[PDB]
Symmetry: none
Subunit: 390 residues, 4 copies
């Protein structure tokens, strides 16, 4: 019979600004009155959370809400947690106390912080998201920029976007005390406002002992701080070793990927096969893609718009007929490499099976990925981790 | 320490046709080789399911998939279960062995089978859904907007129905109804997943379900526009006092002509023992999000001044923009959507008699071809 | 002793839309229920006005008000009247019943309608104006476009712009019955709204006989309809002859000019001497120029804005000091060739003196004017007329 | 049929210095070679003007031009005329021959000369103006520490024009007009003044019988104190109308002062003006367009104000933090800007019977002078009508 501590709800962030204001915020700003720490001139918000010492099992739910506060763009986002087992992390790097470890250039070029190294474990992602174009700030009924960009089939713009995911598997990374944060690749002073809620529901069953969950971050190419766009996959596969000190049963891989390069023909808009392997065996092999981005239209008041001519069938006063029309196409409608402006990203899972104690290899290959070329910022945001029960 | 029976998965239907073929199927066709029973000329498919005698708690998940097999329309659908405590049900009515009880015309007009009566409990809905326009059969441009790169080939809905386990326990007849009138019809799939608790001490709670109302016109029934003349009021009995009772309410508005209840906002007010427990406008304003599931929808050209990027920067011009019937805002659904029931915490209910009332006061009457109506089902759930 | 008819006020236009909607309006649309006639797809609004047969002298005041209705730009405008003595005019040209007369290419190239010809007298301008950038439509307190474009020294945007001029000298062109209108070089469907009021204040003096005023339009390069950008001054002076049927005493010339070509280094932004002559004698010789456009800032919420670095002296907490800052400069702040976005244009006057009956010459020279070059639309909008009492 | 005398143009002052040089000019200096009389050490310039005996109606236009000749601040100014009907005036007070009448302290404290008294009618203002910060002398390259990027060039002087036809009776035949500037520097300013009288071309157009009656003037021309009296009491006074008058109009000229932070120069204060116990004006004297005068203020003080600003950068529209210059001259003020004149507010009073009438000016939240905080209100008022 285990004691009940009760549920825990945390309003981590509440319309907390995420922006780029290098005159107000340097690489590191200590905790403000609300506990918010800011890194990289405001592009990263961070907060220490405490959770009671749960003995019973729990369910963990994450709810992230974003709105533009002026920034018009669809920027990349990462809700994350600093790994507890890592001496080096984003915060003490920002403070100037540490640095990402140097990497072997034959394997990882100049891609610091994407794989583990001495005293370093890559940042763990709680949720990858992509902001829509200007939701909120540009969403009013008579907004001077978006009011005549609203298609006839969209009765009203949404005022914000919200994503919810079960992250129970990540409880080990949140337990007792942890630093969680949100990063948005924003370069405007107006930026965004972000909200984040953690809901920990404690089991009502007296006998329900908390299982021994484990999490092992493997990789993270998100360019949080002093990092470079990850187009490395265009020249080489990213291969790394990892250790399993103890044999583990029924291990699962979680893989989070989005493709980027927003110019015409860039990796944001072209299909590229991802092949992920463990110990030389393929465990995921698929094209990260979405063809439903029109479904996010009401979240994108400030998206760009083009007129595409098309012969359209329709019902006129004298029955069915056809005519040439000029049909609006929004940038937000376009199919993309595993996301849409206004979507989150569900991690792909793969059941790895049992892993013996000892050395193992992990490989991520996006063989036709394109190189950065001047202003063509082709890259792939990839993070991965393992989870299992001991 | 309770024994583990393990999980149970049932592929109830698998691309099972739902159609209207009165030359092949009469009002009742007994179970075929795959266990499928057909009622009303194929408009209803039904199957007996069996589940192990679970002692531990469980989670129940329902997954329904639909595709057109030629039918072009957005027709109403109901995935349901025949209440175990009812002598009279859709099946024995179809067999010609029973009939919905006659009703008091002062209270319910000619709306047979929508409320309980002698030996009758209304059908219980596991999931209300609305088919999209021709998904699958018509999914391969004059129809496809430039912002839709490809049509989906089918539509799928998933809901947790754990609270309905008592209606499914041991043995039950589940089915799918689609208001289809074509021989080509649809194909429907249905999966039930019962995930048993991995915890040794986790005793199954004593869940209860009590169906109160169901206006879905399954068989020999009339369009439910009754709300336009009177509120639907009924009594129900609670044999035992119950704590923390919850009401689940499933509503969709209908009448697909211009200005009909499918397309106009109407406040729904639901009461128990004279106290309002729900009061809201059932509405959806996001139906454009379902566009890729509607290849066969009707289309109009609407004029509009539009902002766009031309060769000399941003500018504006008059255009004629396609608007699909499927894009239109509706009374709590879209072609291709399911319906999440609204919940309300009723609180404690004493043993004895109680009243239940559903009021949609501005609902419109059927008028010739204007088929205004409201599909409403409701039930109570609680633990003893 | 002359009878008093009293004053006459006419609300010619009242937030009447001026726009470019070729699918709704062809070259000519007849008078609507309010008397408004539309030409050139909505770019020109026109209306027949009637005035009592005044015997006493009068004062005529014109009041034009404009607001954007979505069009973001600072477009050229002309409030005008169709000359009574002209068989051919903008309206019957729009109706397809007439055409500007063909011109001698050695003198006027392909600049149709800018000088008189057979059955044609150039349009007479009541007022030349330049719309500001988006006033009204983009002027609200929290407008998503103009909100952070408001300089600290501008407490609030204006919601419209209004110009008033005395046009008493033009009474002969308005007398009894006349067609007046407004043209705006708008190419957007949203366009503008325009208002126009004529106030005729009758003299209170019993003996005050109306003088015999005369008006003679000479030139007008405004491209109202099927006309070309007037960069002709870059290759040749515009010279023309005119006839004075009767000798006239103390004749005055009125000259309305604005320079154009909004690209960097174009005639909108460069000083160009104008030299105007009658019978070979210079009567005006000046640089049409304004250096006070910053004064119109509150009318230009949608103007473009740049950040210009500058070392600025200021009072800080430790006394007088200096620092590098980035100071906003608006397109509307820039000095221009005789106008600002949001200004009207006061005609320059010159006392010509007496003119004998017969032939006379008139010449307008802007010798360093630039040519049109692809997208560089250099030109000069020039109109001129004579006025005198007989 | 009335004879035509033709138009009259008078160049009253032409870059005539207005300054404070007590060693060169005492309280009174008689007319110099150009007819210029100087009072209070140069702070006031004065000149006798003559106008033909016009029988037809006329229009009177006043054009005043000012430039700094070294004086850097935005000082108060008053273009005026000595009332013809007054025995006591600024000039004979300066000469030491007369004095403002003593006042009742319970009503007017120590505010001499602001209301009428025995043998005294307050000075009549043709135009109230406020000099800009150093125009001309400091009105000088591409990058400048003082000149904002949106100001291509400083103006070299400032000019104001007003129709003052209603004031013809105060100018008729012969009158002493002048300019006062509250300057305390030896460098001071230069001032120009032109009067243009345009005679009607109509034979029948008889000049109407216009009248002017000065009521109040708190401008501290000579041996006078800053007028913060409104902060303790309303200014109430009586006046006499020897003959009944029809359709009388009140003209009220007000500017608020106290140039320190939070002073009456920069705070909104309701003015309530009453005649015979009825309110005739009730309003906040205010201007919110002072940025429009920027090019006339080269020597103004400047602050840096932080703000997020939208702008076009090389990669499209964006926003960033900046420190934006705000000039003292840009600030909203109590009915003026550095470089502006003041249009009088008018009110139609209606008919006034012959006899006694009362007039009252109340600025109830006006602030008191406090050491170097020189809060005050410059107010003048007069009546006009046709008989």
């Amino acid at each position: 019979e285990l004691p009940a501590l009760g549920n825990t709800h945390i309003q981590v962030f509440d319309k907390t600004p995420v922006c780029f204001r290098p005159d107000s915020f340097p690489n590191y700003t200590p905790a403000n009155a609300d506990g918010v720490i800011r890194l990289v001139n405001g592009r990263i918000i961070l907060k220490k959370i405490t959770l009671p010492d749960y003995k019973r099992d729990v369910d963990v739910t994450l709810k992230v809400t974003v709105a533009s506060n002026g920034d018009r763009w669809d920027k990349s986002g990462s809700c994350f947690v600093l790994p507890k087992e890592s001496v080096i992390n984003l915060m003490n790097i920002a403070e100037g106390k540490r640095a990402f470890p140097a990497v072997d250039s034959t394997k990882y070029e100049k891609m610091i912080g994407i794989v583990p190294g001495q005293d370093y474990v890559p940042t763990l992602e709680l949720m990858r998201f992509m902001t829509p174009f200007g939701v909120g700030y540009y969403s009013s009924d008579n907004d001077s920029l978006s009011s005549k960009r609203r298609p006839v089939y969209i009765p009203k713009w949404e005022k914000s976007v919200t994503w919810v995911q079960d992250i129970t598997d990540l409880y080990p990374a949140l337990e007792r005390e942890a630093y969680v944060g949100i990063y948005i690749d924003t370069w405007t002073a107006e930026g965004y406002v972000a909200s984040m809620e953690l809901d920990v529901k404690e089991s009502k069953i007296t006998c329900d002992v908390m299982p021994e969950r484990r999490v092992k971050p493997l990789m993270n190419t998100v360019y949080y701080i002093g990092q470079t766009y990850p187009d490395i996959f265009s020249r080489k596969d990213v291969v790394m070793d990892f250790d399993m000190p103890k044999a583990a049963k029924n291990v699962r891989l979680k893989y989070i990927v989005t493709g980027h390069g927003g110019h015409s023909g860039g990796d944001e808009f072209v299909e590229k096969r991802n092949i992920v392997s463990v110990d030389g065996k393929e465990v995921l092999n698929f094209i990260p893609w979405r063809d439903d981005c029109a479904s996010f239209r009401r979240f994108n008041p400030a998206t760009g718009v083009w007129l595409i001519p098309r012969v359209a069938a329709y019902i006129g006063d004298k029955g069915y007929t056809t005519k040439e029309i000029e049909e609006p196409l929004a940038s937000s409608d376009l199919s993309r490499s595993n996301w849409c402006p206004g979507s989150d990203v569900m991690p792909e899972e793969a059941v790895i099976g049992d892993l013996s104690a000892g050395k193992h290899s992990f490989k991520v290959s996006i063989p036709e990925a394109q190189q950065v070329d001047g202003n063509k910022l082709n890259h792939w945001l990839v993070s991965a981790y393992l989870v299992w029960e001991e």
